[PDB]
Amino acid sequence: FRWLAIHGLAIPTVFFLGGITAMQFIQR
Amino acid sequence: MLTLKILVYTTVIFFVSLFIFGFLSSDPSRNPNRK
Amino acid sequence: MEALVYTFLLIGTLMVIFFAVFFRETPRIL
Amino acid sequence: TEGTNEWFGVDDLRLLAVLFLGHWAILSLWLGSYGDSNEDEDFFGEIDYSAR
Amino acid sequence: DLDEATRTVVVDNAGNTTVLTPEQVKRGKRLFNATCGACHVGGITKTNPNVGLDPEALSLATPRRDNISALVDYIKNPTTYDGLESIAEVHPSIKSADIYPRMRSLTDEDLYSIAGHIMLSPKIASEKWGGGKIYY
Amino acid sequence: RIPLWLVGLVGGLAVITMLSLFFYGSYSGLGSSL
Amino acid sequence: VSLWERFCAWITSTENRLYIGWFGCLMFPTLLTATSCFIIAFIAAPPVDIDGIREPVAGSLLYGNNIISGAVVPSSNAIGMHFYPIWEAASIDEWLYNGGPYQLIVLHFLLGVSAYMGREWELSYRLGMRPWIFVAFSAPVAAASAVFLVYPIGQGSFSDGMPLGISGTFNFMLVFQAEHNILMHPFHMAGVAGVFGGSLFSAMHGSLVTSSLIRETTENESTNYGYKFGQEEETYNIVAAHGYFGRLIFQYASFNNSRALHFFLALWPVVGIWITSMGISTMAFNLNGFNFNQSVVDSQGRVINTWADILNRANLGIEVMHERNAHNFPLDLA
Amino acid sequence: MITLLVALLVLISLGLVVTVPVALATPGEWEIAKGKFNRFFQIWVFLVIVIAAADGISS
Amino acid sequence: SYSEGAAYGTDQADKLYSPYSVYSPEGEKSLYKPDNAEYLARKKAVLAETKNRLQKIPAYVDKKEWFNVKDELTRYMYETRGAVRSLSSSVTQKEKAEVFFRALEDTYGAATLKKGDAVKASNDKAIAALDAFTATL
Amino acid sequence: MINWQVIGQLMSTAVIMLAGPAVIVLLALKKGNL
Amino acid sequence: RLPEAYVVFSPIVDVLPIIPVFFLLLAFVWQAAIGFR
Amino acid sequence: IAGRDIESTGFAWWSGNARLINVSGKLLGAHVAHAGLMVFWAGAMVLFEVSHFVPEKPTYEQGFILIQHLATLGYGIGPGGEITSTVPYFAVGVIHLISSAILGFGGIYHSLLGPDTLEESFPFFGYDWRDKNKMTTILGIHLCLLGLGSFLLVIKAMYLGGVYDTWAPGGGDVRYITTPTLNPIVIFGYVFRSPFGGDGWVVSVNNMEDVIGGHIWVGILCITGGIWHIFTKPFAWARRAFVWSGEAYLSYSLAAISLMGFTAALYSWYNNTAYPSELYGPTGPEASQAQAFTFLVRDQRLGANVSSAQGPTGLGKYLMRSPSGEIIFGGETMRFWDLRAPWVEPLRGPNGLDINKIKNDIQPWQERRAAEYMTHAPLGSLNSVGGVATEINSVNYVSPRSWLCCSHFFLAFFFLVGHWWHSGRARAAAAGFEKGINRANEPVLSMRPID
Ligand code: CLA
Ligand code: CLA
Ligand code: CLA
Ligand code: CLA
Ligand code: CLA
Ligand code: CLA
Ligand SMILES: CC1=C(/C=C/C(C)=C/C=C/C(C)=C/C=C/C=C(C)/C=C/C=C(C)/C=C/C2=C(C)CCCC2(C)C)C(C)(C)CCC1
Ligand SMILES: CC1=C(/C=C/C(C)=C/C=C/C(C)=C/C=C/C=C(C)/C=C/C=C(C)/C=C/C2=C(C)CCCC2(C)C)C(C)(C)CCC1
Ligand code: OEX
């Protein structure tokens, strides 16, 4: 079943974008 | 040096006038559709 | 003496360009 | 004299007679066919196929 | 890591040292780039490269210019490098601030923070400040 | 059933809220040279 | 019947060997003069003051060069943007010293290439073709006019124009890097993607046709002789190459339409070179690429280096060394 | 009073743009009701003159 | 906070001219006070030298040098319009200055056209017009 | 000191960016001439 | 900045030049809702 | 739905406004809606440019492009390029904003409720593209407006307030144009110059008397030629050369608008008369000369003879001689020896830079100007940090000249591509083969052998 094919690529991608939005608000 | 210069304006507006009066020579009608 | 070889390579290249355009094997249908 | 503000780069008077005899020598060729035609003949096309 | 020992800068000609509050170092950068930084970017002077904002070059001026009280002195009255005559007519100042529209609205604390930035920047970047393009 | 153009609209403006958020933090925070 | 109609019938005849056309009336005299002056100026031409400092740079073969180092040198810094023909030079020796033939070649080149482009339109009109091959040729015409015409305009001199040579090209590219930072500019980025993508889809389309050829030859003769010229049968199974690429990546990423496929091959490079040639154009007027130098700092305020700071120190090396005698003042305004 | 009328001028132009192309793209809504809408144009134009009046008086 | 870019007003303690600025307004506690005499004495000094730069005008028109008269009224006299507009405070003082300018713009408009009397006529319309300016205020 | 400017800008884009598709969404519900 | 009777609307004015870009995107949203037909 | 799908027309959704060629009401509503957007931007941008205005920084450091066009007209500008008021800039941005709501309503009325073709109901406004009497009338009506719009510059520069002359004697100020230049040897002198260096075809107009005197002749031509094309009909040679169709007129404009696109992008780089350096910042040529003049002043104070100061190459370090003989500045700045600027023209002579006037008469406003134009040279980056390409990130400046010369120049190539696309199609749509080659009748097969 193809739920292992997409979500090996999409479950990381949303997790890293949760971090890239947090790094916009980090300052010195 | 003013003898060469005369020779260039002959050659330019010879071919520029062939260009200008080329497309005035009913140039859209020269197609393979008709005439 | 050295630049004589470079000139011969350049005009020799322009010869085979001339023969390829005008003496080309003209393709024919049937 | 390069940066002079002269029309078409015409520095001397002799260069004019070059320009006038260039446009006119081909104009007179052009009038030999497309000149002396009817200037009052229209069409409702996008493109005219009138004559030579 | 802006420790208060690093923010502590020299304030008078005698040699007393006071500290800069963290709004002084922040307004000190925004005002310096907006006002002074067109020519004094990074400590070098574009229009006269001999007279820089180096801590060596500020010290060798005939009035010593390293202090905060000496720099705000220069802003309200800019003499030359040997301090004999005034160049207020050509350097932007407070005395000649009718010609320069950029300095018609500056308070005492605003020059206190701009001069704070000129003094605290060689302590942050030791060799980049006024070192030219070699130390970019 | 949801119309497909509503799905591309909401996700499409969601990307704009993600992209313009990234061009925001080029001028603020880290990497802004402030 | 008239002499002009018998001349218009010949000059627009497709029955000529090479179609001349009305653009060939100013393509052929322009490009043969750009050619015949280039061959002489590349082989036998004396050195040229390019920096305007009376230090003449040799560029021709008779003055000790080769194919790589020899180049038609751009005109002087002393002239700059001024029009400098032969008759405004008081001798040919004064013309060849100050960078004469660079302006004669380039100005007859850009007229002849902009007329070669309109000539590709004209024959498409007289042959019944849909017209737009000449729009695809606008992309190298945009790029030729960017480095020979537009960049000397915004920098105010033909001396910053591109040297007509091979080593002169890399003198042009490196000095353009230090002064304008082209690699960080997003329009060189959009045309590296245009030619890496262009050479991809070239070799990707050319392989899937050659993969799916139909048996028409034997194993002794050549593969190419299974195509007779002017035949009406299709020479490759296009359903086969669609099912291959439909499994090589996935199904929905494959063009079954061969017309939309052969359009995407024309879109991607040409749009990539239109955008790139308007990178040189907007950097001709000193709107440079990105500059992220000293952008990352710690909380103390010390500059933390990035890859752009390492790239900056490569730009500072070329900036302090290009035209090592021409400068007198601390900022390269030109 | 200028800050009160311009704030009333913006809120009407919010109310029009949501409703006027809806009133036109519908096959009959503009013909059935435009004398309702024509008041809102005449109110909207009248506010621009009132604000232009109040700006010249105040300067 | 140190690297906050869009802190328009929460950062600083003093009120700014606008959120899109760095500078404080022209209100109190400023170091530039425009009522000072040395700003008035600077603007008055260029008005005095302007008459001295304007009496050298006919010496070049008595000679043949038209390039020196076109720029004598722009070399030093560039700082005039900044001062005479600034010294013009009252009502009738203001519409006295455009009498001086229109008389001065015809000196430059005649120097480019190389008219000898039209410079010498309009020069006397300028010395008499700055006489009207300085004597009032 | 609650940063009224950014609160004003982010609401006023979201009013305007949602006033555009609301012209279309109100037409799709109405089944008018799109 | 704006005159004193208009300093209130300084956030709304900042959005206003962006709005012509939103008409370009309004065409595609309208083509999506019509079903590209 | 008929007329709005590919089954009825034959055009896809992406080439969807090509369905508007042979309807006239939908096409009119489209041209008045895009005119509603051109207005709307200019009103909303100036309000954006007013709300971010600060009196401290100069007019060009703050990065504006539209409130510097109105300062050339003379609104709110003081002497020396000092913007004073900024209440009249608010007034202009509202009239170009309210009016777009009216032009907006014409675009939403004429294209959603207006009749599809005007030729049925409204015989004055209705037309056909193949008609040649009507199209010269539409050209004629819309040429007399461009004549009248050119006199509004002339009325405003002679009667209503005046315009900003940067060459005005005594300093740059709002000056009434009293005596404009009406000499056709001078006014059409510009139009027939060389476009190269030194002549500089139409960019090189160097005083406001030729500008305002020139916009008179434009109003004379555009009215007489407006009346010419209303009355007359295209001649025999003009009917044979053109394609009288809908898209062909569009590709005629796109060629000419690209001519205007490059030229406005080259005004902004070189011209310092229509675009004063007090407002738009120093030009490319001007900031190269201001550097050499600043270090001229710097080393003259060190007691150095700057005329005899031998340069490192053997040329003049400070003063050298141009290839026409004039005394100029030396360096890489020898290429920009045609730089005519209001702060350097006080030091000119017949020969050039007068050495006696450099040794004695340098005024401190010129030193304040050349130091200002050195540090604000038009050299920038896309993230808006100034200086050279290797400058560190501290300043925030890109010149408004470099935004105009890189964006209108950017567009002016793509509109030259619009002349190539839309005229290739229109010439082939007139001939019939824009859809492809006929399989039954191929024109190549009925030709000679190939050779
Ligand atoms: C409703 C009508 C109306 C209109 C249109 C105006 C308009 C204006 N008033 Mg006004 N006013 C009005 C009613 C109106 N007022 C009323 C009822 C009163 C009370 C009796 C006043 C009292 C008043 C005073 C006391 C003053 C004004 C002033 C002004 C001007 C401000 C600009 C300026 O400083 O001048 C300088 C001029 C300009 C900046 C030119 C602005 C116009 C340009 C050309 C933009 C137009 C472009 C174009 C039309 C737009 C494109 C649209 C196109 C798509 C069709 C402006 C033109 C001031 C004035 O005139 O001072 C000079 C002023 O002091 N008003
Ligand atoms: C004012 C000038 C003008 C006018 C009225 C038209 C009008 C038309 N064009 Mg034409 N065109 C123009 C200029 C113009 N064009 C230019 C300058 C070019 C060269 C780029 C073209 C190239 C062109 C092509 C290649 C085609 C047309 C087509 C058409 C027809 C349908 C257009 C359509 O549905 O597009 C709808 C619009 C879109 C789908 C959007 C396109 C995507 C753009 C590029 C995105 C915008 C990018 C960015 C956000 C904004 C640009 C940034 C930049 C300004 C810095 C219509 C007759 C079509 C045709 O032939 O019909 C007969 C067609 O196939 N045009
Ligand atoms: C400059 C932008 C512009 C403009 C003015 C137009 C205008 C038009 N297009 Mg069009 N188009 C554009 C860009 C544009 N297009 C682009 C970029 C594309 C490519 C995606 C297309 C693709 C396209 C297609 C495929 C078709 C059109 C069609 C049409 C015409 C009729 C639309 C209609 O009746 O449907 C009804 C329209 C709607 C229901 C849309 C409602 C949206 C409303 C009007 C928005 C109003 C918002 C505004 C802020 C309100 C102001 C109100 C005022 C009171 C203040 C109309 C003239 C059609 C045509 O050819 O007609 C024959 C058609 O088939 N267009
Ligand atoms: C160039 C733009 C343009 C053109 C050609 C038309 C053309 C037309 N419109 Mg239209 N319209 C436009 C813009 C335009 N409109 C705008 C902007 C709006 C919004 C206000 C409208 C709103 C509108 C409505 C509501 C109606 C029309 C109607 C009509 C048709 C008949 C008009 C009539 O009775 O004529 C004769 C009319 C007059 C002589 C009155 C003219 C008065 C104006 C103010 C004179 C203009 C002054 C000046 C020239 C403009 C200067 C500003 C400029 C610099 C921008 C006609 C085809 C009618 C129609 O089709 O019937 C169903 C109709 O009902 N139009
Ligand atoms: C928006 C501008 C605009 C546009 C698009 C047009 C469009 C057109 N005009 Mg028009 N025109 C305009 C403004 C405009 N006009 C103005 C302002 C004037 C007043 C000067 C004229 C005067 C005018 C005349 C007198 C004629 C046209 C003609 C034409 C048609 C195309 C011819 C052409 O472009 O040849 C481009 C050709 C050139 C740029 C060079 C032509 C050189 C001429 C033929 C040499 C003969 C000398 C002649 C007497 C002029 C003396 C000047 C000099 C060359 C010696 C076309 C309908 C022709 C037509 O068909 O009339 C209805 C025509 O005969 N126009
Ligand atoms: C993306 C769209 C876009 C945008 C935002 C701009 C933006 C701009 N363009 Mg532009 N341009 C564009 C696309 C764009 N361009 C394209 C695609 C082209 C074709 C290649 C051009 C070609 C172009 C030219 C040729 C020029 C500009 C110019 C300008 C600038 C000033 C606008 C102007 O002159 O108004 C023009 C407004 C009108 C024509 C409307 C009529 C105005 C009337 C006549 C004014 C009357 C004034 C009068 C004195 C007032 C007195 C009133 C009193 C009597 C009461 C501005 C930055 C100008 C500029 O500054 O160049 C650097 C310029 O010369 N553009
Ligand atoms: C003037 C004014 C006003 C008004 C405004 C307006 C009304 C505006 C409009 C605007 C608009 C009009 C908007 C629009 C928007 C839109 C959007 C934002 C969209 C987007 C989206 C996206 C982008 C998506 C898309 C897509 C799809 C859907 C599918 C396919 C694909 C794609 C992805 C493309 C007001 C009142 C405020 C007041 C002030 C003034
Ligand atoms: C404002 C001003 C001015 C004025 C202006 C003028 C006066 C103008 C003129 C203008 C003009 C006077 C222009 C002209 C143009 C022209 C053109 C540009 C042409 C074109 C043509 C064409 C396009 C053609 C084509 C063709 C051919 C070639 C062949 C056949 C076909 C045809 C016909 C199509 C001055 C300078 C003082 C200064 C500044 C200000
Ligand atoms: O000539 Mn060729 O390279 Ca363009 O930067 Mn400036 O100028 Mn020169 O130096 Mn660097």
Ligand SMILES: [Fe+2]
């Ligand atoms: Fe293929």
